[PDB]
Symmetry: D3
Subunit: 152 residues, 6 copies
């Protein structure tokens, strides 16, 4: 598939998501990096988002709870180039009912080539990276040509 | 889980999705019922959408292609009460790349209790039902109450 | 591929299956439509079946419980043209051990093109549909042609 | 859970199933042990069963093809205690459409505790075992106590 | 695909694994077969292995707990040809977090064609089989040729 | 549960894995950062490894091909604390036979909290991160305590 470029802005649109057993883990991480995160645009699934705004006082755009469709809402935003970073702490030790949604979301994040962290170590590596606070160009699939070839 | 209601408008917002090996099967179903479908509002994933509007002249609100995010866009619309009927002809004899997206879409449609058809027989029954062209209430989960329980 | 036709009888052979968290929904639905379900022949997996028979007094041919093989028994009956309608309320908010059995059953229902409802709205539309109490022809794959093409 | 006992007959009801890329393997295996297999009752999925009977002249009770519902037909027979042994050479290297049916089939063979082989090595150890031609007691879930528990 | 052969030594390297609900079963099975098992080399996942040695006094090479990587460690050993027999009593009635690991390990055992038992009935037939203590040749995929093709 | 800590050495042990449709993408990424990667220890699955070394002349500890067990070999080393970073470019637009193996590897990489990149953007952010060349502490599950409770 042919590729094209997209610019991730200096102020990132970050999606924050965590399963219940990983919530306290995501909360700790968000709290120790708050000064930095307060500089970007935050999005989150329903429960996670409300817990964060409650604990940190930061402004978060909360979507629907994951099981109720929040996961796919974030997925759609990503496919629309509305999300630049995805922090998804899914539980690797307890199966969830929205497992397909979880896999679907990660699949799309892979496809659209945006930075993705599924654990703390990766999250720290990402936010400490130089281009986290600067604009940078990434290579994304050329959807227009992808679609055109589908209709030939 | 506490339930509430939502009213499906007389002119239904119908999403039409089909995997490649099912596109001809969907095309034919749409042509056979065009006189009826013309009275409603059509949505579809990228490829399916363009193939239809071209072969019938009907106006279809085409989202991104399934693999590229279309399925999740539809799922999001469903969870937001913007889609009232789902017609999804997925291939039952051929694994696909966006299988998780497929399962996640069907799960949400189940959750939000909207009429869903995954084959021709079900689609025919739904479309021939008396209230297909009428406003009718459906029971939906009470998100607000559901969320509160979560933040407690 | 290669398709032929089957005629669903006026007196439908209906399979009723529900996951625990959805059993009350199914039960209520059955009670509200007992007059009509009174006619037609009813089948069900173990637990679901006995509960219905025990609360409504209707005759129900109960198979093994889902986890014990009931889903596959229904599946087999469908592929053998013994089931005409499938009412399957699977839980979209909880994971189950017989998940593959569930997906397998829905795959076969799709393949054999019979009316399938996975939520109340879909069930209501199918049962309210005019040709629900009539003989209706459905397009089904021609197994003979399919098998012949396998042993070429 | 409650467990009771069942006796596997001296003369076993064997189910033979193989995916397309494993068919030649199953065929050879069958040919090498034909004299012994002819002493038992043979069952198979559509394609597999015909290929075997056409090549060996053996009497095989062929079910529908796997993708068309044969796997579930076998699963049901196992759950009903009509299949005592399962030889299923599935393909661990290729896609395969009826994947859930495959997992569901193996799930039931595990649940109902019957000898199961998914490769030649295991198939050989099983058929060469001293009690392959004898009656053998196996522990199986006690459905009665299971269902009774599910109710009341 | 090119196939070659490997010889399973007379003294087998057995891997023993069991999900929680099946541990008691495996334990008892091991004790009733302790005489024969002592003549072999035993391996097991963290929890399973410790319980066994702490009850039978037998020497068991315990890997990591399954959910922590045990299943994959066993998987690697098999592909490396260091495991000859796999006795894996996985829970067919309860969803586990390491589900993919479970499936991946079973996939590999199938690929490398080693004797595998997933229930007691199969475990008994395999262990009593004549060549369980003899050196036996098995067909395995010829990796050397398989790799060479990949690099053409 | 109980978490302990581990220190990734300044000289990282990097695992490189890619599905066929992503190999060209990984090669390009590798050569683009060869100067830096040259200072670290590289590991990879069969095909990927050979293709890399045979192209850059860098030393690569190649494992078996993914479908043949290499995915689990890598997963095993990660769980053993031998792999510090994982670059896994899996195909998001094409389903693979060793899919369970793929998910299991990703699951373990999540549990053991190591930096994980599934696309180029994530890989670049990690490798461009300042502490990529420093000794860094990461929180990991306290296995000892974990196992202790299991045997309480």
């Amino acid at each position: 598939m042919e590729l094209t470029t997209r610019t991730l802005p200096a102020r990132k649109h970050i999606a924050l998501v965590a399963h219940d057993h990983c919530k306290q883990m995501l909360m700790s991480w968000v709290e120790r990096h708050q000064p930095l995160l307060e500089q970007h645009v935050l999005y989150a699934t329903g429960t996670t988002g409300n817990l964060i705004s409650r604990a940190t006082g930061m402004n978060v755009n909360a979507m629907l709870s994951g099981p109720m469709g929040g996961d796919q809402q974030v997925g759609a935003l990503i496919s629309e180039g509305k999300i630049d970073v995805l922090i998804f702490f899914w539980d690797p030790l307890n199966a969830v009912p929205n497992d397909p949604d979880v896999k679907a979301l990660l699949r799309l994040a892979t496809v659209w080539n945006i930075p993705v962290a599924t654990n703390v170590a990766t999250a720290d590596f990402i936010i400490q990276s130089p281009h986290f606070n600067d604009a940078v160009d990434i290579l994304i699939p050329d959807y227009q040509r992808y679609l055109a070839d589908r209709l030939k």
